[PDB]
Design a protein around this ligand. Sequence first.
Ligand SMILES: Cc1c(NS(C)(=O)=O)c(=O)n(-c2ccccc2)n1C
Length: 165
Amino acid sequence: SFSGYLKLTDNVYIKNADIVEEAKKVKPTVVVNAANVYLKHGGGVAGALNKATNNAMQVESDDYIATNGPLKVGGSCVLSGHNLAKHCLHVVGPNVNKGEDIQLLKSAYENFNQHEVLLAPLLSAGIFGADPIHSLRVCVDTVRTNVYLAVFDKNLYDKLVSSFL
Ligand SMILES: Cc1c(NS(C)(=O)=O)c(=O)n(-c2ccccc2)n1C
């Protein structure tokens, strides 16, 4: 199972870890991807998860978009986890660098409540431009299921833990 996580609340845990390396090690039922509406996994967590699947995640995602059209900002879809997890929950948090409504971050985290346990990144953090401290706050106040957060940056991990209310 998950190891080396710091407990933040009854259901939220956090670790300074590369989510691809965590997924390969644990092979969770659900790994969350920090997706965009087009499921174009170019950079950040999405690019790293896709590269770990040898681009199979992108091929599957392009078929999904060809059939269904784009996701909504705040929305999600369940696809295969390939070699990383049983499933990948592609969740679209607002990209504040694209002027998307940060209030949609709570809607994005609500998708996690449809799964008993997830390995996840902080939504809208990193290249999505939101304040990661705010993202962790929204996570703990929204998600009721068991979420294991993998925060790649050590310095951000320390700041998140030391400032956690
Ligand atoms: C690598 C990285 C982030 N991704 S993460 C959540 O995997 O550590 C993240 O959110 N960043 C950041 C740090 C300070 C303030 C705002 C954002 N950094 C630099």
